[PDB]
Design a protein around this nucleic acid. Structure first.
Ligand SMILES: [Cl-]
Ligand SMILES: [Cl-]
Ligand SMILES: [Cl-]
Ligand SMILES: [Cl-]
Ligand SMILES: [Cl-]
Ligand SMILES: [Mn+2]
Ligand SMILES: [Mn+2]
Ligand SMILES: [Mn+2]
Ligand SMILES: [Mn+2]
Lengths: 109, 83, 98, 94, 94, 105, 99, 87
DNA sequence: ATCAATATCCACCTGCAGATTCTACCAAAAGTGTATTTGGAAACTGCTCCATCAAAAGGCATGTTCAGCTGAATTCAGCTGAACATGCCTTTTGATGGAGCAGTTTCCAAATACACTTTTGGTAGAATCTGCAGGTGGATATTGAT
DNA sequence: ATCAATATCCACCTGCAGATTCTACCAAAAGTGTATTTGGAAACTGCTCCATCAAAAGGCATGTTCAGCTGAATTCAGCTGAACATGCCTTTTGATGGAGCAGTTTCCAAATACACTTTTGGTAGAATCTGCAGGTGGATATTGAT
C-alpha cells in the first residue's frame, strides 16, 4: 500500500498540476490529454508567474512602497520588452501608462 | 437650461485630463466633440456584445464577466476582473 | 499679478496624470451614460457595481491609448496641437474606420 | 460553491522569488487574469496544433510547440526549459 | 486521395443566384476558404458560449447568438432569419 | 432514405456540417439544430457574396468569376467588408482609389 | 524636338495601371531565393511546395501594399505627397507592429 | 552529393522597380529615395516572422517540407488570414 | 546666465483604518487501484511532387542625364486655446431597506450518444466543350508644346 | 485656343487551357433500436443591486487676457521623376531521378473508465500591518525684471 505524493510536487512545482489537467480535459481542447501536458503547462504558467512577479516586485520597491500594486505590475510589463508583446493587446486595470513625454513638447533651455 | 445627454455629462475638463495621461501638450476645441463621438462608439458596440452575453445567459443583470468576455471579443483583453 | 506661460502647466499637468493611476471620467456621469447606452439594446437591464468600473477601465484605457497614437500624428505634421483630423488618421490606420 | 483561483500558487511563487514581498488584492486579481489568459492561448494553440495533424490527443509535445509559437524570443526558451525540466522530474516518480 | 470540399454546394448556390454565370477554379478555391473560415469563427464563438454558461452542448441557440455576435448588422439579421427557420422546416417535418 | 439537408430545404450538407462539429471539440455534444441552423448561415453567406461578386463579374463583361471580382465584391460592399477586413483574397487586387490631393489640378 | 510627359504624370498613369491588375509584382525567382534563404537560416535542409511559396509571395505583396496606402495617408497627412521612412515608421507604430 | 549554391544576400533581389510597383498599387505618387531600403527592412522582418511560424508548424509535424497549409496556418496565426490555398 | 520672488515639489515623520495576512475546520477535488480500450509509433513501400538542369529569348533592371517641381525653410498676422480666478452645483459618500433575481438542489422527459446495417451522394480521372487572354489595328482622349 | 504625340479604349479573331460534363467504385450519411445524461421546471433562498436620502466638497462652467501657434505665402536648392541605351537574368519548357509523403498494417505504450481513500484549497471570522491621508518645512523650477 503506497500513499499520496501530489503530482505537482513530483514535478517540483508550486502550480497545481492536477487541476490544470482537470482544466484541460474540460476545455474542449482535444479528445485526450497526455499526462505530461498538464505538468509541462503548469510549469510554464508557474514560470511565467515567477518572471513577471520578480520584475514587478523590483519596480514595487523602486516605487518605495512595500508591496505590489497593479501600478507596479504595469511598470514591470511595459518596461520589459519581452513581456510587452506577450501582453500587447492586453489592458492592465488600475495600471496607468509609463511616464512618457515627446521630445518636441518640452521647454527649450 | 441644462437639458443635455449624459454624453455631455462627460465633462469637458475631465474629457481630457485624459489627453495628458495620453501625453498631450495642447488640444483643439473641436477635439472634445469628436472625442465624445469616439467614446460613445467604443462603448456602444462593446455593450452590444456584452449584453448578448447577458441575454444568451437568460439573465437581466450585466455582470463584469459579460464585459470581460466582450472586451476580449473586441480584442481589448482586460486583466483584473475574472479573465 | 504673476504666472505661468501657456503650455507650461500642460507639461506640469501631463506629468501629474501620467504619474497617477486614478480614474479620470467621473463615476455617475459615466454610469448614467453606460446604462443609457445599455437600455437602448435591451430594456430592463441592471448592472454589477464591478461591471461598471470594468467598463470605465476599458474606456479610459482605450481613449488614453487612442492617443499617445494621434499625438504622434499631430507631431507628424510639424504640429503640437491635436485636431480631429488627427484622431481620424489614428483610427484609420488602426483599422477602426477605412 | 465558492469559485476557485490561482492566488495561493501565485502568492507561494511570490514568496519564493521575493521572500520579502506581498501582493495587493487587485494586483493578485491581475496576476490571476494573466495566468488564465496565457493558459488559454497555449491550450488553444496546442488544441489547434493537435488538430492540424489529425492527432487525437494533446501531449506535452504539443504544449511545447505551442510555447514556441506564442511566447516571444528568450522568454520562449526559459519556458520550454522549465517545462521539460518539470516533466522529467515528474516521470522520475519512483 | 479523398480530399473533400464545399465546391459542389457553392456551385449549386452559384446557379441559383446567377444561372448564366460560372466560377474559376481559383475563385472557387477562395470561396472555400470563405466557407471554412466563416465556419470556425461561428462554431468557435458558439463553443465558448456554451462554456461560459457551463452547459455541455451546442444548440441552435448557440449557433445563433454566435451569429448575432460575429456578423455585422444586416447580414447578421438576414442570417438569423434565413437561419432560424432552416430549422423548423426541419422540425416541422418528422 | 431522405437526407437532412433537403429535409431543411438547404443546398449545404447539414450532415457533414454536423460531423465537422465533431472535431473542433467545440463541445462534448452537438444538438440536432446546430448543424442545420449553421449550414444554413454558411449557405446564406456564400450565396450573398456570390451575387455581389457575379454582378462585378458581369460589369466586367465576363461569364466567370475571378478572385478579382470576389475582391471587388467584398471590398465595395461595406458589411461584407467588415466581416472580411483581416482576410486577404489571393489574386485579388485592390479597389481603384487615388487620393484627392494627388490628382493633377 | 522630342519629349513626352511631365513629372508626376506617368506616376498616376501607373497607379491606375497596377490598381487595375492582380499580377504579382515581385519577381518570382528572386522572391523564392530570398524565401529559401530565410528558411534555411531558420532550419536547414528544408523543401517547399511551389504552392507554399506563392502562398508567401501573395501574402507579402498583400501586406506591403496595404502598408503603402497606410503610409501614403501619413505622407498626405503632413502636407507632403512623397512617402518617406518617417511615414512608414508612423504607420507601423500605429498599426502596433512594433517596427 | 551536390550541394549548392550558397544563398546569401537575396534581399536585394527585391528590386527598386518592384518596390515601386507595389507602391503604386498602394496608391503612392512619389517616393523618397530612402524608402526602398526601409521597405526591404520591413519586408524581411515580415517574411521572417511568418516563415519562422510556418516552419515551426513544419517541424512539429515532423515533415521536412513546408506546405502551404503551414504557411496559411502561420499567416492566420499572425491575423493575416489568407484565402485561396487550403484554408 | 544671475538676482529676487511667488509658486510648486518633495522627502522627512507619523499614527490608523481599511485592508492583508494569519488561523481554525469542511466538502470537494485529486490521487490510488484495478480494469479495459485505443490512438499513432514503427516499419515498409507505393507514388507524387520537388529539385535541379539546360537552352534560348526578350522582358526588364540598371546606370546615366537633365530639369522640374517637391520639401523645407523664413517670415508674420491673426485668431485660437491656455491660464485663472470666480462662483455656483453636480457629484461623492455613508448606510440603508427590500424587492429582485441569480444560484442550486432535486427530479424526470426529452434529447443525444453508441453500434450496426443498408443506401446514396461525392469524388476522382476521363470525356467534351468553350470562356477569354493576347494580338491586333483603328478611334478617341489626354497631354503638353507653340 | 490649335496641333502633334502618345496612350487608352475597345471591338473582332481564335486555338487552348481550364472549365463543365459524364461514368463508375467507396467512404459517409441516414435509418433503427437500445443506452445514457442533461437542462430545465418547480421550489427556495442569500446577496447584491436599485431606489432614495442628505450633507459638503471641491470640481465645472464662465468670462477675460495674452501669447504663441498654426496656416499662409515666397524663395530656392536639390532630389526624384521621366527617358534611354545597355545588357543581364528571369522566365519558359521540358526532361528526369529520387527523396519523402502518405497510405496500410501491426502491436505496444499510454490514456480512460469506474470505485473509494485521502488531502487540499478556500470560507468566514480572528490577528496583524502598511500606504495613506495630511502637516509641515526645505529646494527646484519658473518668471519678470536688471
Ligand atoms: Cl451550499
Ligand atoms: Cl451522384
Ligand atoms: Cl490563331
Ligand atoms: Cl487539359
Ligand atoms: Cl504618501
Ligand atoms: Mn504528455
Ligand atoms: Mn425503407
Ligand atoms: Mn544564410
Ligand atoms: Mn530638503
Amino acid at each position: 500500500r503506497a500513499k499520496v505524493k501530489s503530482r505537482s510536487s513530483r514535478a517540483g512545482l508550486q502550480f497545481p498540476v492536477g487541476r490544470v489537467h482537470r482544466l484541460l480535459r474540460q476545455g474542449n481542447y482535444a479528445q485526450r490529454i497526455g499526462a505530461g501536458a498538464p505538468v509541462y503547462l503548469a510549469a510554464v504558467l508557474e514560470y511565467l508567474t515567477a518572471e513577471v512577479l520578480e520584475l514587478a516586485g523590483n519596480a514595487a520597491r523602486d516605487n518605495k512602497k512595500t508591496r505590489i500594486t497593479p501600478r507596479h505590475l504595469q511598470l514591470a510589463i511595459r518596461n520589459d520588452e519581452e513581456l510587452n508583446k506577450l501582453l500587447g493587446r492586453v489592458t492592465i486595470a488600475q495600471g496607468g501608462v509609463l511616464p512618457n513625454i515627446q521630445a518636441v513638447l518640452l521647454p527649450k533651455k | 437650461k441644462v437639458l443635455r445627454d449624459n454624453i455631455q455629462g462627460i465633462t469637458k475638463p475631465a474629457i481630457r485630463r485624459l489627453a495628458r495621461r495620453g501625453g498631450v501638450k495642447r488640444i483643439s476645441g473641436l477635439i472634445y466633440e469628436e472625442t465624445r463621438g469616439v467614446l460613445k462608439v467604443f462603448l456602444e458596440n462593446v455593450i452590444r456584445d456584452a449584453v448578448t452575453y447577458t441575454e444568451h445567459a437568460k439573465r437581466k443583470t450585466v455582470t463584469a464577466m459579460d464585459v470581460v468576455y466582450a472586451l476580449k471579443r473586441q480584442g481589448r483583453t482586460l486583466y483584473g476582473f475574472g479573465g | 499679478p504673476h504666472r505661468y506661460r501657456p503650455g507650461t502647466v500642460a507639461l506640469r499637468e501631463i506629468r501629474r496624470y501620467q504619474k497617477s493611476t486614478e480614474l479620470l471620467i467621473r463615476k455617475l456621469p459615466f454610469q448614467r451614460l453606460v446604462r443609457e447606452i445599455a437600455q437602448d439594446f435591451k430594456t430592463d437591464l441592471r448592472f454589477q457595481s464591478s461591471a461598471v468600473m470594468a467598463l470605465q477601465e476599458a474606456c479610459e484605457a482605450y481613449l488614453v491609448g487612442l492617443f499617445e497614437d494621434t499625438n504622434l500624428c499631430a507631431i507628424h505634421a510639424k504640429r503640437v496641437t491635436i485636431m480631429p483630423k488627427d484622431i481620424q488618421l489614428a483610427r484609420r490606420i488602426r483599422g477602426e474606420r477605412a | 460553491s465558492r469559485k476557485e483561483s490561482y492566488s495561493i500558487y501565485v502568492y507561494k511563487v511570490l514568496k519564493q522569488v521575493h521572500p520579502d514581498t506581498g501582493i495587493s488584492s487587485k494586483a493578485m486579481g491581475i496576476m490571476n487574469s494573466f495566468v488564465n489568459d496565457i493558459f488559454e492561448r497555449i491550450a488553444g494553440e496546442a488544441s489547434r496544433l493537435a488538430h492540424y495533424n489529425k492527432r487525437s490527443t494533446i501531449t506535452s509535445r504539443e504544449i511545447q510547440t505551442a510555447v514556441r509559437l506564442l511566447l516571444p524570443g528568450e522568454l520562449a526558451k526559459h519556458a520550454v526549459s522549465e517545462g521539460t525540466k518539470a516533466v522529467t522530474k515528474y516521470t522520475s516518480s519512483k
